[PDB]
Each structure stands twice: as C-alpha cells, then as structure tokens.
C-alpha cells in the first residue's frame, strides 16, 4: 500500500535524447529513427525572440548550421524541415535505441512523465498534468527546452509534450510532437495570457478513492448529491464541471470501494464548503488533482 | 523555474532488474556483474513468514530451485549465499548492462529514487527520504519486494535500499545492498515498533530557500535567532535539532539568496508558532521535509 506521484520508467526515452546546437543556442532534441525533433526556436538569436519570422530565419540556415551530439558521436544532419513549431532534422543514422513509439495529443486533465534534460543529458523524471488552461506546473531551467513528456502503454512510448516556454508566472507551455501548442500560446517573447486555471475535479475524486483504499476515510460523509447540485457548488470554487463520462471513468474505483461516484461528489462538496480543518488526506493538506483515475488504478493494481 | 519532487533517470537500473522465483514465491532481483541480489524471504512460504528459520529453509534449497529470468533469457544459477537479509545468487552470465555502481548505506534525512518493480518489470520511479525513524513513505504492492532505491553521481549508480516489508501502519522497511535493515526491523511477520517520526529540519530549510528562489517570499520575517533559540523551539514541534554541519550544508543556498541560515531559522520558528494560516509555500499547505540541500541545488542549477 501507500500512494506517490510516480513517473513511468524513463529508460526507453533516455536513449532518444540528443543535444541540438545552433549558434549560441544549445537545447535538447528527440532522436527517433533517422529524424531529430526539437523546438524551432533553436534558430532564434535572443533578439529574434521578440518577433521572429521563422520562415525567413530558417531559410538562412543550412543542414551544417545544426550540430547534433548523441553522447560523443556527431550525427550528420542531411535535411531540415519545419512542422508547425518543431524542427525535423533528417540525420544520416537511424537511432538503434528507437523504441516502439506514437505521437499523441493529450487532453486537459491527463498526466504524463517529463524527462527533464540539459545539453541532451537526462537530469530528472517527474509526473505532471496538462492543466485545464493547457499549462503544466513543471520544473524547467535554461537549457531544458526539447525535454519531452510521455506515457508508456506496455512496450509503446506515446510522446505527448515537447517543452518550449515558461510564462512570467513560472508555469510552462509547449507542443505535441507535431509542433502544435497546447493552449493559445505562440513561440514568441511577448505578453501571453494563460487563462484562469481551474481544478481537475475528476482527478480530485480519483485521489479521494486512492485515499479510501489506503485507509484514509475521515472525509466520507452520510449524504449524496446530483451531477447538477455538485457542479453548481464546484463552479463557485473554480472546479471543472463533472460530466457522465467522468462518472463512468470513476466506475472501477467506485466498484472496488463500494462507494458510488455521487456519494464521493457529496464528500468533496463538504471539503470545498467546510474546508479540511487541518486534517491531511494521504499526507497532503490540500485537495490533489494531478492523478487520473488510470493513475490511481495503475498504483492500486500495480500495472507493469 | 518551478520546483518538483524529481527522481533520477531510471534507465541504468532498469538494465539490472530481473525476476527471481523459488517454488511459489516470485519477486524482483538486482543483477550486477555475475551476481543476482534479492530478499532472502523468496525462500519463505506465506506460513514460514510467521517465524522463519532462514538457515533451515536455505539448507533445503539447491542452485536449481532458483529461477532467474532477465526478460526472456534464463540465467543459470551456479551458487547461492545468504548475506544478512539478502540472497546472493551466482549466475553463469555477467550482466552486460551493469553500470559503474557502489553499495552505500544512506543516513536518515537523505533522499533516493525507488524503481518500483513487479515480476522483474519496472512499473514506476518516485523519490523519497529515509525517515529519522528509518522507515520510508513509499508505494509498494504485493510482488514489489527486491525493488531498489539508488542515487546517481554522473555515471555511477549508488544503490542504498532494497524493499522487504510493509509494517501494519502502511509505511515501509528494507535493507542496504549488504542485507542490513535500516532501523530496528527484522524480516518476520511479528509486531515491530517504528519509533517516533520527527521532521527533517535541514530539508524544511532547503525547501524554504527553494521557495525564495521561485519568488515565494511571504514567510520571510523581521527577526533573527540563534542555533540554541531555534533548536529549543524545534524540539517542542518534533523537529530534528539543527547542527553546524546543517548550517554549512545550507551555505550555497544562503549565498545564492543573500539570506543567512539563522534568518531562515527565525522565519521557520514563526511558521511553527503561528502555523501557516492556510497559505501555501511552493503549492504545499504544509512544511515539506523530503528535499535535501543537494536536491534543491540539483534543481536550482540543473545538474545532469
Ligand atoms: C528552453 C530554451 C533554452 O534554454 O534555450 C537554450 C539556451 C527555455 C526554458 C525556459 C527558461 C527557464 N525556464 C523555462 O521553462 N526557454 C527559453 O529559453 C525561452 C524562455 C521563455 O519561455 C520566456 N518567454 C517569454 O519570452 C515570454 C514573456 C512573456 C510575457 O510571455 N512569454 C520566459 C523566460 C519569459 C526563450 C524563448 C524561446 C522562444 C520564444 F519564442 C520566446 C522565448
Ligand atoms: C514484497 C514481497 C513480495 O514481492 O512477495 C513475493 C511474492 C512485500 C511488500 C509489501 C506487500 C504489500 N506492500 C508492501 O510493501 N512483502 C511482503 O509480502 C511481506 C508483507 C509484509 O511486509 C507485512 N508485514 C508484516 O508481516 C508485519 C506485521 C507486523 C506487526 O510487522 N510486520 C505486511 C503485509 C503487514 C510478507 C513478509 C515477507 C518477509 C517477512 F519476513 C515477513 C513477511
């Protein structure tokens, strides 16, 4: 038993991380088959970043302006292509460590593992969520860009995130592996509004089932509610509305514990109204929303 | 910027994980060179676990009663030895993925990465601390035993932990890689008292520095204090006393921020006395103690 913020094992992704250099700019790239993927802003001089014309800037680059190091081995870049906000660098070598992989675009509320890298070297692995406003609360310093987020489905790495930017508020923004930003964000150093960040209500409920499974039950009350009563209270507290799809997703946890979703909604309504009164749930003094119902089922069934 | 509970990349340790089977009992093993390391309780039937005589049970086993699977490859066991609470199985094949490695015994308050495994397969990586009472707040299910904890110093993997036990209180106990238990625990299904779990004061201070670096300053107060004033208050709140070694170790963070250790001690004293009043620090509604000063330096400098 016990419950922790758990990342997927990072090994299959470590063997894909290379260093991409263009003039001063050194950041991380993802080496799958004979293609290296990185942020297209590797081609920007800090001055460009104000208002970059990425076509005009890329046009003035040759294959040879791009330095790719895989450990100590140099990869010959034999092609440079722009797909939305990512650079695709064709290389002379297929990566022999390439795992089975897909590119996915994840939805708000979904979690992924981030392999935080600097100079194409892995430093750290942490789990986080796509926030409803399509930001992530990550840990990223200078050189971290091109760090990827991924899920693992047995043998298949599903890449969902590539890190491009921090907003002045200290939260993070990036793209799927086809170079489309999550959220209304652009790869430009100008004022960008995130949106009001709401709580992921379905995830809070899954974490409350996590809590009951680990013997933390003090917040289980007598009452019940409706999807409509609950949502009317939830919106007051900047919580995402709960839909029937959310209730059906919470089904297995409901069945395991013998607590109906709408009884757990009734308990969460209390916690929002009356507060936690200084009691912790699974060692946290606040309601946690960065665990999906799959994340909870993984870690209370032990999927490998 | 940003700040997360971050595990080391798990790749080098994934390459060492094997499944060990003895009669019914299946659990995880660590394969370094031509030796497999696992919990000695692999030889116990659930009935034995009440009061096991490990000599009498081991005596009745031969090299061929031991099935080691490394993915699909069966390893031929050519020798079996007991060192404290671990089995050493001599195998015909040195592990070609053996990294540079040490066995270290960590101190209370130090952090490590856990690679949670089932049937010799990696499922997840999370960071935690050796509690002052020599327990860990982990996530382990049935089959998790032989899962290891490690630190990584560039290319060298320092193994510090092998999981053996959950206590009835839902916290965890295990050994160093020479099979010595952390704390007063034995590998038996009998009543074992953990000890009073205190807060790791040096880690709380490092985390407060982490907070100031990330723009979270609201708790920086007017006062100062002495090592003795602070410690006198710290003991009242079940915090570990702060020593000169702790002040010296907090030096880099002190220098970075221009905030002297005893000024941060003075701030922490207030938080203990007044409580947190419902505000958060780095997204937590309580004082976090599972980040060392090295962990904070790692993540506010980006060591790779
Ligand atoms: C990754 C790239 C890098 O380090 O370059 C190689 C040397 C890096 C990661 C972030 C910096 C520290 N924390 C991070 O997450 N990203 C950058 O270097 C970009 C930094 C930004 O994201 C800036 N964003 C803005 O300029 C901005 C300001 C406002 C109001 O809205 N957006 C913040 C640090 C402010 C640099 C960059 C790259 C590409 C761009 F199109 C713009 C900026
Ligand atoms: C790992 C062993 C494994 O993989 O089994 C091989 C098939 C596993 C870890 C725990 C299971 C649940 N979560 C865990 O972290 N260990 C066990 O299966 C042991 C179970 C325990 O540790 C029990 N502890 C006690 O028996 C106990 C009771 C008291 C007062 O103090 N300690 C808990 C389930 C309660 C089984 C085991 C192994 C070795 C032993 F010496 C005794 C018991």
DSSP chain B: ------BPP-HHHHTTEEEEEETTEEEEEEEETTEEEEEGGGG--TTGGGS--HHHHHHT--GGGEEEEETTEEEPEEEEEEETTEEEEEESS--TTPPSEEE--PPTT-EEEEEEEETTEEEEEEEEE--TTS-B-----TT-TT-EEEEEETTEEEEEEEEEEE-TTS-EEEE-TTSPBSSS--SSSS--------B-HHHHHHHHHHHHHTT--TT--S----HHHHHHHHHHTTBPPP-HHHHHHTHHHHHHHT--HHHHHHHHHHHHHH--TT--BTTBSS------HHHHHHHTTT--
Residues of B in contact with A214 (CB under 8 A): 170
> What's the angle, vertex CA B190, arms to CA B186 and CA B191, rounded to 5?
95
Residue corresponding to tokens 């004082």: B287
Residues A260 and A296 in one domain: yes
Query: Is B164 noted as a catalytic residue in this protein?
Result: no
**For residue A90, what is the domain's CATH number?**
2.40.10.10
Residues A187 and A126 in one domain: yes
- d(CA A181, ligand 1 centre) in Å: 14
Interface contact flag, B126 A10, Cβ < 8 Å = no
Residues A3 and A144 in one domain: yes
Of residues A15, A144, A302, nearest to B123 (C-beta): A302
Residues contacting B242, CB < 8 A, separation 6+: B201, B202, B205, B227, B230, B231, B234, B265
Residues of B in contact with A271 (CB under 8 A): none
Q: CA-CA-CA-CA torsion for A49, A50, A53, A56, nearest 10 degrees?
A: -70
Tokens in use for A209?
Answer: 């089932």
Ligand 1 site, residue A168, Cβ cutoff 6 A: yes
Interface test mutation site (partner A, options B28, B125, B167, max chain A beta carbons within 10 A): B125
Query: Is A41 noted as a catalytic residue in this protein?
Result: yes
> What's the angle, vertex CA B158, arms to CA B166 and CA B113, rounded to 5?
45
Residues A216 and A280 in one domain: yes
Distance CA A189, CA A185 (A): 11
Which of A71, A99, A127 corresponds to the end of one domain?
A: A99
Q: Which atom of ligand 2 lies closest to the CA of B138?
A: 15
Ligand 2 site, residue B29, Cβ cutoff 6 A: no
Residues B27 and B156 in one domain: no
Residues A1 and A137 in one domain: yes
Residues A126 and A4 in one domain: yes
Name the closest-CA residue to atom 39, ligand 2. B187
A with B: how many residue pairs have Cβ under 8 Å apart?
148
Residues B123 and B7 in one domain: yes
Residues facing residue A89 across a β-bridge: A36, A80
Residues A250 and A203 in one domain: yes
Torsion over CA: A141, A143, A149, A155 (sign): negative
Distance CA A174, CA A197 (A): 17
Which of B175, B197, B219 corresponds to the end of one domain?
A: B197
Its domain, for residue B122, covers 1-14+100-197
Tokens in use for A81?
Answer: 């292509």
Tally of structural domains, chain A: 3
Distance CA B230, CA B283 (A): 25
- d(CA A173, ligand 1 centre) in Å: 9
Q: Nearest-CA neighbor of A189 among A50, A30, A18, A6?
A: A50
Of residues A6, A119, A141, nearest to B116 (C-beta): A6
* Chain centroid to CA A155: 20
**For residue A256, what is the domain's CATH number?**
1.10.1840.10
Do B86 and B38 form a contact (C-beta atoms < 8 A)?
A: yes
Residues B53 and B123 in one domain: no
- d(CA B52, ligand 2 centre) in Å: 13
Burial A147-162 (b: 16+ CB within 10 A, else e): bbbbbbeeeebbbbbb
- Residue of chain A with shortest Cα separation from B152: A123
Residues B139 and B9 in one domain: yes
Ligand 2 site, residue B40, Cβ cutoff 6 A: no
* Chain centroid to CA A142: 19
Distance CA B19, CA B31 (A): 10
Resolution in A: 2.3
Distance CA B104, CA A211 (A): 34
Q: Give the Å distances, CA to CA, from A170 to A189, B213, B215, B282.
A: 14, 11, 9, 11
Distance CA A88, CA A80 (A): 6
Q: Of residues A16, A29, A38, A41, which has the active-site annotation? A: A41
Do B90 and B68 form a contact (C-beta atoms < 8 A)?
A: no
Which of B197, B218, B238 corresponds to the end of one domain?
A: B197
Distance CA B229, CA B272 (A): 13
Residues B209 and B60 in one domain: no
Q: Which atom of ligand 1 lies closest to the CA of A24?
A: 7
């Amino acid at each position: 038993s016990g419950f922790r913020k758990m990342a997927f094992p990072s090994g299959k992704v470590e063997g894909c991380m290379v260093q991409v250099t263009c003039g001063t700019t050194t950041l991380n790239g993802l080496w799958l088959d004979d293609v290296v993927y990185c942020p297209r802003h590797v081609i920007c001089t800090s001055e460009d970043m104000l208002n970059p014309n990425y076509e005009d800037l890329l046009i003035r680059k040759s294959n040879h302006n791009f330095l790719v190091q895989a450990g100590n081995v140099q990869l010959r870049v034999i092609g440079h292509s722009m797909q939305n906000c990512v650079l695709k660098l064709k290389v002379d070598t297929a990566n022999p460590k390439t795992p089975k992989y897909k590119f996915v675009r994840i939805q708000p509320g979904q979690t992924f593992s981030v392999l935080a890298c600097y100079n194409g070297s892995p430093s750290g692995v942490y789990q986080c969520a796509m926030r409803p406003n399509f930001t992530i609360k990550g840990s990223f310093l200078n050189g971290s860009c091109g760090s990827v987020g991924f899920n693992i489905d047995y043998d298949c790495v599903s890449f969902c995130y590539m890190h491009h930017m921090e907003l002045p508020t200290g939260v993070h923004a990036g793209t799927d592996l086809e170079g489309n930003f999550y959220g209304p964000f652009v790869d430009r150093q100008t004022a960008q509004a995130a949106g009001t960040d709401t709580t992921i209500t379905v995830n809070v409920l899954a974490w409350l089932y996590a809590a009951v499974i680990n013997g933390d039950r003090w917040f289980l009350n007598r009452f019940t509610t409706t999807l409509n009563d609950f949502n009317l209270v939830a919106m007051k507290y900047n919580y995402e509305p709960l839909t029937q799809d959310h209730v059906d997703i919470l089904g297995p946890l409901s069945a395991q514990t013998g607590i109906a979703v709408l009884d757990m909604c009734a308990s969460l309504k209390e916690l929002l109204q009356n507060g936690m009164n200084g009691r912790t749930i699974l060692g946290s003094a606040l309601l946690e929303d960065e665990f999906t119902p799959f994340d909870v089922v993984r870690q209370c069934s032990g999927v490998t």
